[PDB]
């Protein structure tokens, strides 16, 4: 159907955010936040005024989305008065940040109407000789600025802030970080050159703020499909009634997640899976597909992995949990887990379960380790940065030299939690009380 | 190149005069940042105030006369000395030295003192700590050598070269704490040259602490700097008053020609007079001096207060960017309240129930054991313990079906979103551990401000 | 969304989720897509059949497990992207770049920007899917490695005709929960049960078992009939090894090939129509897993004395010669080992023959020490400890007629 194909594509483009600048969706609770950001952008490109503001907000709090909308609004009228210089804190390191500024400057100057030539010392020398009828606003977009605010030295943070007060070239720095206390991460001299302009991103307070945001993301305000007038009546009917299924999923996510991009991960596959207009109105009223998405997200955790185990995989995890529970530090190995499993088979058959030999439990023991159930005692695991990951690979741990039957392991789930996720129909329920 | 200055000539007497060479002592990126304007920048009555308050000497009398007298007795007398400048970051340390060099440059043109060369070397504006030798050799000699060739060239030049074919060099050692290395070879070489007879080098070191050579440097480098040190005292409350009044001397208590059509103001159509209350300047300079006495902080407070007043003035009229405007004390007090406030308290009050339950469960475990180190397995057991308190009541079981089953019969009873959210916000901490039960959880923020957010819900 | 959804066995929800994200239009396609799922869940099977039925999508496959370190990973991305774009549009003259020049995360953005600038002659926007089958399977893995790939599309120009698409296939669960605050549409893959595992192995092994060389040579020495025979052996293997293997596909596929020639030779002219007599004739192939497929006298006694010094306190040694085995062994000294070894030895001084057998005992990794690489035997601070289990040390003492169980009773 050509009518449903135009409505399905328009509804999906609104949730992802690929709409043009002339048809962007602005929420109600975010309207008072983009006005302050627009004031700084309009004052540095038009009025040519140096500014410095570092945004502070949680993850997926519409930080980069608001900055991308301000750059697209100014490009539709003032596209020859400023440039776009983007920076990252995770990709660009300390030495790579110097070459990243000179690289983004030679490609933006040739587009309006070298710098990144030589060694690392000659590159930084040409940058200070350039930044430090009208001028050109050098808009700096810094992402994850908390990584560059190291307590050892902040070289880039000291030179970037110097291009605002002393320098005459209008440089607009828009830092984006997640730390709430970004003022303490700076040095004594770095914080002196900053204007102390920390704009905190607002969050969802009441329940009506999330309803207006979802309604504005699924309402087609353009005449591009004959099913537009029929879809707006169905969406407004389910949202205005608090006893519907759409209002229940919003209230549940408001007290558990309270995030707009998180809830948008389930509305996108709900519309794309609809074959026609009749299937779209049915899934939006009963919300049958939303319950399937919630079960899949909690299917590979500690609860969903227990249902995919056999009778031997459950008996080993139960017998190994009783050893660490009765111990002082919870240390156990393969020899301690085999003693509890062997005493359980002879006790049940005395009141026929095939007793496996010690040569067969080795395959079951290694299968539970890969399934995230038995963690090594006093083990770091995944390192933070790449520095500690290289030093840990060259050092041979003590657990690799000792055999597998003498390796100290730890239980990822205590016996108190196993009794709640096991029904009464199983025969291994009597050995989970101790 | 790699050839030092010692192998450039044959002998010592064979070196010609360096002052008559069109290459010693200094003998293209400003055109690409220009564009044509196709509009008109509408400047309101508050635009001229913000531009004059920017960082681009009535409160410094004894400090300006001490640095000028130390250099006047060495340049004319053809000697070498070392001036130490220490103070709070933002008291006019670099600006005082810049005014001394600018005053000495005007006296050199009057045929009074010999000509000198001003070299500005910043420690924080360099990538490598050994890059300061290449910058000094390029400004004095004019060549481009490496860090190893420039170090040996400066020693041979500041010793064997006589004074009849030399020239005074004034080097400003900006950010002295940035050039501090482990071997302490760069800091010692920059101070040992001033103790030579045939040197004629003026070194003006600028740091941030008076006890810097007594803590980082040793007894050898401290004996070469000098016992006399100039301490830059921070600005008080009576010195910051004339600083703001000097930048807005011709703008305060003056009439403007603000247009009612666009909003353009012309400094001498309505006759709008701009006046700033004197009480707002006294209440702002006193708070700045009571914190650190930063010179840039006193200018940023009046600039932020004028920006807030300009936002309400443009919104109430509907101007754009393209009777008497009086800045009261409300704009100044609001400019200082946005910084001294703590957004950590209001951040936890707007979180969801799952995020608020994790904070309430962590604080309850601290009042039972008192160890400031609760594991991840104890928080999960404490959360489930609070749910089963009144399980028989219908009012409490309504939330158990969502936190453990999400309102679905097919979803089993659960045992990550709110955990990683508080970690990136700088509130909660978590050690590097592969286990999810014995992993200790510590609080980064205070404990007094965390309990106030739980009681507000 | 115009795409074809294939039919996958027991993957109706997983196939519908891939069609809702992967599309030919970048405006309705997310920049990140994680396919979390453990081994034996069918992550690669549901992705190959989805891209084979639709030939309009251009996907790039990459295996990070074959690059060990993270440095060759950045070089393999720019090398596979340029090679894929070369054969896609051969009528466009592009410039070949060196993939070995990508040594930093910043250099990857400059290399990808120098390629997309010469591909602006197209009409519509063509997606570029970069499937990373096994992202968490990389060796030198850290918590900051995934943060550099989820923000790659931000540095890329928005006005580009070719947009990259990252697809990750994780394996564990804790690795996915570390980035749950980024709001990434993750498609989980639950493990199959006892009803879906046997059905998958039947529709995947019947086409190679009935046409094997062993089964065709047995019917001539002693197509619907051979199908039920091969299907009965697969069902009998899963039901007999459901507890030893669990729900893994690789663990059950190896046991089938290991018992297929042994099950064909046990079939005669009477066991072809009677499945009851065939199961009784080959009872040794289902009751067990069939597994998988000279020490010196001084060397045997040295391991006995080393087991005592590593599992007993040295303060009570003056009362015997004159469960601690369930924990890690303790470290002892060289002179402390020769004292017990000389007492338990039958009717000998410490000559070079005793030290020769002790040095060879450490080469076979039978006794551990305090240093692994570059060990100093003459150092007085380096201690020695045992490194053999109790079952290994039990059979050694039984060959020399030595009572080793009475010392710990
Ligand atoms: N250019 C864009 N076009 C469309 N949507 C966008 C764009 N930039 C961001 N978004 C949307 O913004 C939402 C919220 O993430 P956003 O990038 O705004 O937050 P962030 O805090 O800057 O990011 P992160 O926490 O991952 O560092 C995402 O779900 C994404 O869909
Ligand atoms: N008397 C003054 N009147 C007005 N402004 C002043 C005065 N003295 C100093 N300043 C301001 O002080 C600012 C900082 O000066 P300077 O470069 O010397 O800093 P500093 O004391 O070395 O410390 P930092 O730069 O690390 O904050 C200058 O931009 C200048 O505008
Ligand atoms: N639903 C299914 N129907 C039929 N065959 C299947 C199904 N799921 C998986 N398979 C088969 O399982 C075999 C082995 O699984 P495969 O290695 O592809 O899975 P995976 O989950 O992608 O693996 P890994 O975790 O190692 O990346 C494949 O060759 C495929 O044919
Ligand atoms: Mg972002
Ligand atoms: Mg300074
Ligand atoms: Mg695979």
Swiss-Prot record, chain A:
- Residue ranges annotated as coiled coil are none
- Primary location: nucleus
| GO terms classed as biological process | DNA replication initiation; pre-replicative complex assembly involved in nuclear cell cycle DNA replication; silent mating-type cassette heterochromatin formation
Which keywords has UniProt assigned to this entry?
DNA replication, DNA-binding, Nucleus, Phosphoprotein
- Give the InterPro entries listed for this entry: ORC4 (IPR016527), ORC4_C (IPR032705), P-loop_NTPase (IPR027417)
What GO CC annotations are associated with the protein? DNA replication preinitiation complex; nuclear origin of replication recognition complex; nuclear pre-replicative complex; nucleoplasm; nucleus
Places the protein is found:
Nucleus
**GO MF term set:** DNA replication origin binding
- Function, as annotated: Component of the origin recognition complex (ORC) that binds origins of replication. It has a role in both chromosomal replication and mating type transcriptional silencing. Binds to the ARS consensus sequence (ACS) of origins of replication.
How does the record describe its quaternary structure? Component of the origin recognition complex (ORC) composed of at least ORC1, ORC2, ORC3, ORC4, ORC5 and ORC6.
Annotated family: Belongs to the ORC4 family.
Q: What else is known?
A: Present with 2170 molecules/cell in log phase SD medium.
What name does this protein carry? Origin recognition complex subunit 4
Curated annotation (Swiss-Prot), chain B:
Subcellular location as annotated: Nucleus
Gene Ontology molecular function, alphabetical: ATP binding; ATP hydrolysis activity; chromatin binding; DNA replication origin binding; metal ion binding; nucleosome binding
Give any single GO term for biological process: nucleosome organization
> Binding residues for ATP, per the UniProt record?
87-95, 175, 208, 296, 318-322
Keywords linked to the UniProt accession: ATP-binding, DNA replication, DNA-binding, Magnesium, Metal-binding, Nucleotide-binding, Nucleus, Phosphoprotein
Q: Which GO terms describe its cellular component?
A: DNA replication preinitiation complex; nuclear origin of replication recognition complex; nuclear pre-replicative complex; nucleoplasm; nucleus
Specify the domain of life of the species encoding this protein.
Answer: Eukaryota
Q: Which residues form a coiled coil?
A: none
Q: What is its main location?
A: nucleus
The UniProt annotation places Mg(2+) binding at 174-175
Q: What does this protein do?
A: Component of the origin recognition complex (ORC) that binds origins of replication. It has a role in both chromosomal replication and mating type transcriptional silencing. Binds to the ARS consensus sequence (ACS) of origins of replication.
Family designation:
Belongs to the ORC1 family.
- What does the domain comment read? The N-terminus is dedicated to mating-type repression.
Q: What else is known?
A: Present with 3930 molecules/cell in log phase SD medium.
Q: How does it assemble?
A: Component of the origin recognition complex (ORC) composed of at least ORC1, ORC2, ORC3, ORC4, ORC5 and ORC6. Interacts with MCM10 and TAH11.
- Name of this chain's protein: Origin recognition complex subunit 1
User: What gene is this protein translated from?
Assistant: ORC1
From Swiss-Prot, chain C:
Per the record, its GO cellular-component terms are: Cul8-RING ubiquitin ligase complex; DNA replication preinitiation complex; nuclear origin of replication recognition complex; nuclear pre-replicative complex; nucleoplasm; nucleus
Tell me which PANTHER family the record gives.
Answer: ORIGIN RECOGNITION COMPLEX SUBUNIT 5 (PTHR12705:SF0)
> Which species does this protein come from?
Saccharomyces cerevisiae (strain ATCC 204508 / S288c)
What the entry lists under Gene3D superfamilies is as follows: 1.10.8.60, P-loop containing nucleotide triphosphate hydrolases
Q: Where in the cell is it found?
A: Nucleus
UniProt-annotated binding residues for ATP: 37-44
Q: What does this protein do?
A: Component of the origin recognition complex (ORC) that binds origins of replication. It has a role in both chromosomal replication and mating type transcriptional silencing. Binds to the ARS consensus sequence (ACS) of origins of replication. This subunit is a candidate for the mediation of ATP-dependent binding of ORC to origins. May also be a substrate targeting component of a cullin-RING-based E3 ubiquitin-protein ligase complex RTT101(MMS1-ORC5).
This protein is called what? Origin recognition complex subunit 5
Q: Provide a Gene Ontology MF annotation, just one.
A: DNA replication origin binding
Question: What Pfam families does UniProt report for this protein, alphabetically?
Answer: AAA_16 (PF13191), ORC5_C (PF14630), ORC5_lid (PF21639)
GO:BP terms for this protein? Answer: DNA replication initiation; pre-replicative complex assembly involved in nuclear cell cycle DNA replication; regulation of DNA replication; silent mating-type cassette heterochromatin formation
Its subunit composition reads: Component of the origin recognition complex (ORC) composed of at least ORC1, ORC2, ORC3, ORC4, ORC5 and ORC6. Interacts with ORC6. Component of a cullin-RING ligase (CRL)-like complex composed of at least the cullin RTT101, a linker protein MMS1, and the potential substrate receptor ORC5. Interacts with RTT101 and MMS1.
Q: What else is known?
A: Present with 768 molecules/cell in log phase SD medium.
| Matching InterPro entries | AAA_16, ORC5, ORC5_C, ORC5_lid, P-loop_NTPase
UniProt keywords (A-Z) are:
ATP-binding, DNA replication, Nucleotide-binding, Nucleus
Q: Which family does it belong to?
A: Belongs to the ORC5 family.
